[PDB]
RNA sequence: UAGAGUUAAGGUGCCGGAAUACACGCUCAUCAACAAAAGGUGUUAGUUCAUCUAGACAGCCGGACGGUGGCCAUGGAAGUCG
C-alpha cells in the first residue's frame, strides 16, 4: 500500500503495545492504535523488558511490526526464558548457559547481516555476548 | 711617654682617604631590602629515559565504517548508568 515514515524510536519491550509512546505518534496520522499495539503485543510479550524497537509505519489505517534490532533478543531467547537478567554473574548472581548449537545458530543467522569471512568469524563475536548476558557456552 | 718600622679586625662609586681595576659567569629585576602552606610557558645547565629517516613532533587536512541500539543496571540507560 502507500506507506509514509517508518517510525523508529529507541524503546522498551514493555512500553510499545501498551499506551504511552505507542498511541500519539500514529494518532493524528490516522491508524487504529489498539490493533497496532495488538500486533506489537506479540513481540513485547516474549521480548519482556528487552532492548527492542518496532517500526510503526503508517499504512492504510493498519500497521504491523516485530523488530529485534540487533543481537538483543537472540542471545537471551537462546537462553529460552527471555527477561533481561539483571547484571553480571561475578556476584551472587548469573543467568544460566546457552548450548554450543544454540549460540552458533545466531552466528549462522547474522552472516547475511554480518560480513563474515569464515564460519568461525561471527562465532566468537556472539560468544563474547554469550558471556556478557551472564551465560556461557555449553 | 713620643716619632718612625710592620700589619689585625675590617674598607677603596661618593658624602669622607684609597681600584669607575683585572679575569670568567647565570641574571639587569635597582635584584641588592623578612616571611610559610601552596604554585608558575621568566631563563640556563647536568644526568637518565620514552621517542627518531625503521619518518620524531606541531599545525592543517580525514575515515567518522559492517555486526549494531553488542550485552546488562533501570521507571527508562541509549557507546554515552553499573
Residue A75 and residue A104 in contact, taking contact as beta carbons nearer than 8 Å = no
Residue A131 and residue A85 in contact, taking contact as beta carbons nearer than 8 Å = no
Residue A63 and residue A56 in contact, taking contact as beta carbons nearer than 8 Å = yes
Positive or negative torsion for Cα A111, A117, A119, A122: negative
Q: Which three cell numbers stand for residue A40?
A: 506489537
Q: Cβ contacts of residue A49 below 8 Å, gap of 6+? A: A12, A13, A14, A83, A84
Q: Cβ contacts of residue A10 below 8 Å, gap of 6+? A: A53
Q: Residue A60's Cα: distance from chain center in Å?
A: 26
Nucleotide closest to A115 measured between CA and C1': B66
Nucleotide closest to A79 measured between CA and C1': B71
Q: Residue A44's Cα: distance from chain center in Å?
A: 9
Method used experimentally: cryo-EM
Q: Is the CB of A72 under 7 A from strand B?
A: yes
What is the stated resolution of the deposited model, in angstroms?
Answer: 8.9
Residue A110 and residue A71 in contact, taking contact as beta carbons nearer than 8 Å = yes
Helices and strands, counts by H and E, chain A:
4, 0
Degrees, nearest 5: CA angle A44-A49-A53: 55
Cα distances (angstroms) measured from residue A108 to each of A1, A24, A100, A115: 33, 38, 12, 11
Amino acid at each position: 500500500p502507500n506507506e509514509v515514515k517508518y517510525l523508529y524510536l529507541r524503546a522498551v519491550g514493555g512500553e510499545v503495545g501498551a499506551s504511552a509512546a505507542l498511541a500519539p505518534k500514529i494518532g493524528p496520522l490516522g491508524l487504529s492504535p489498539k490493533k497496532v499495539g495488538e500486533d506489537i503485543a506479540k513481540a513485547t510479550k516474549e521480548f519482556k523488558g528487552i532492548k527492542v524497537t518496532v517500526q510503526l509505519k503508517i499504512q492504510n489505517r493498519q500497521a504491523a511490526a516485530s523488530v529485534v534490532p540487533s543481537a538483543s533478543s537472540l542471545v537471551i531467547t537462546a537462553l529460552k526464558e527471555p527477561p533481561r537478567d539483571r547484571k553480571k554473574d561475578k556476584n551472587v548472581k548469573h543467568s544460566g548457559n546457552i548450548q554450543l548449537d544454540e549460540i552458533i545458530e545466531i552466528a549462522r543467522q547474522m552472516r547475511d547481516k554480518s560480513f563474515g569471512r569464515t564460519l568461525a568469524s561471527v562465532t566468537k563475536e556472539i560468544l563474547g555476548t554469550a558471556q556478557s548476558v551472564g551465560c556461557r557456552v555449553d
